Amino acid sequence: VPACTVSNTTVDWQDVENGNHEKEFTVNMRCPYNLGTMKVTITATNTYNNAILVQSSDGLLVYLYNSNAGNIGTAITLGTPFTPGKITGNNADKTISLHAKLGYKPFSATATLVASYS
Amino acid sequence: AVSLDRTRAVFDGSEKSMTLDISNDNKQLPYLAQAWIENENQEKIITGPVIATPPVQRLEPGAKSMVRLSTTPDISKLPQDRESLFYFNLREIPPRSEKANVLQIALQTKIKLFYRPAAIKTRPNEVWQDQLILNKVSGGYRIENPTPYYVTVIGLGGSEKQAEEGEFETVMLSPRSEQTVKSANYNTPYLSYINDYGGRPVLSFICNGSRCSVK
Numbered sequence: 001v002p003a004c005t006v007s008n009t010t011v012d013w014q015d016v017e018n019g020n021h022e023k024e025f026t027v028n029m030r031c032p033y034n035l036g037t038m039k040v041t042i043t044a045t046n047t048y049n050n051a052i053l054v055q056s057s058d059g060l061l062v063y064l065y066n067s068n069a070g071n072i073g074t075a076i077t078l079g080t081p082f083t084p085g086k087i088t089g090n091n092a093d094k095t096i097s098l099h100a101k102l103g104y105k106p107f108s109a110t111a112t113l114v115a116s117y118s
Numbered sequence: 119a120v121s122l123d124r125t126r127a128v129f130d131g132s133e134k135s136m137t138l139d140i141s142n143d144n145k146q147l148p149y150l151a152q153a154w155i156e157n158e159n160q161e162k163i164i165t166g167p168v169i170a171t172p173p174v175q176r177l178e179p180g181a182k183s184m185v186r187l188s189t190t191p192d193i194s195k196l197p198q199d200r201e202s203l204f205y206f207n208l209r210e211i212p213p214r215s216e217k218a219n220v221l222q223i224a225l226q227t228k229i230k231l232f233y234r235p236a237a238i239k240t241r242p243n244e245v246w247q248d249q250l251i252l253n254k255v256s257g258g259y260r261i262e263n264p265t266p267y268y269v270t271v272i273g274l275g276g277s278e279k280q281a282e283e284g285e286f287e288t289v290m291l292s293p294r295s296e297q298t299v300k301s302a303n304y305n306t307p308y309l310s311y312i313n314d315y316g317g318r319p320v321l322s323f324i325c326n327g328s329r330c331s332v333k
Contacts, residue, residue, distance in 0.1 A: 002125075034318050107219055108214060111222070
């Protein structure tokens with residue numbers, strides 16, 4: 001069966017001068033009809049204090065939290081697989097609610113959502 | 119949105135290569151598709167015995183393409199009486215957002231790539247997973263896979279529905295190996311696994327005392 005697909009997703013910030021300005025963003029994966037509980041992993045090229053290190057060894061920090069019913073919940077350990085705490089819909093049209101704080105140690109950081117299939 | 123046609127790949131050892139279909143289903147934007155192989159332990163390998171071609175490619179909106187898996191000479195040094203596990207990875211590089219102060223989310227698909235040597239070549243719809251053996255032990259069951267293939271188990275329970283849906287720690291048993299799993303004791307255990315094409319069949323087990331097998 002075809003692998004899940006993820007439609008382009010990007011979270012925004014207008015300007016803000018361990019985590020400032022909680023934020024809600026969703027990622028909806030369209031998956032196989034029989035996918036089970038599979039957990040995903042979020043990684044980045046460079047990290048620090050469990051945050052994504054944007055763009056010599058210093059930069060901006062982006063923290064990620066597993067959304068909890070609109071309420072910010074447990075943080076996301078980068079590089080560790082996790083079973084989402086905010087999943088809505090069917091396999092054919094899933095959704096993961098997450099939170100993204102901010103910090104520091106025109107930026108366009110990238111975070112890899114790893115779907116490893118059993 | 120870069121998509122891959124399968125959740126696992128089986129490489130027929132009696133073949134020199136095989137292709138994987140991929141596609142960018144985004145209507146307006148072009149995507150980059152990175153492809154590469156990792157070893158048994160998920161470490162990237164660039165010189166065989168299994169290689170991914172091409173390493174990087176662009177897919178214009180709605181475009182379709184492929185990724186070729188081919189083996190090198192050293193592929194022969196792998197056992198020919200069992201499968202060797204590799205991983206196929208496909209990562210998308212989304213068009214750089216023209217926006218500012220933005221965090222891009224990219225998808226990386228990692229699937230199991232089973233190198234299955236010719237001597238153990240399978241036929242379509244062939245089932246070997248029914249050869250598993252469940253041995254009751256403290257905690258749960260020691261599961262035995264006497265076959266030459268990797269077997270991924272995703273469910274185990276007292277009823278067929280309990281095996282399909284029910285908190286279970288997915289486990290993959292290597293060829294000719296066994297592992298123990300935490301589970302409640304069931305008089306009629308049902309095990310669910312994943313076949314070559316992603317289907318999820320449920321097996322019915324009959325326990326003769328401590329040992330349970332499929333009729």
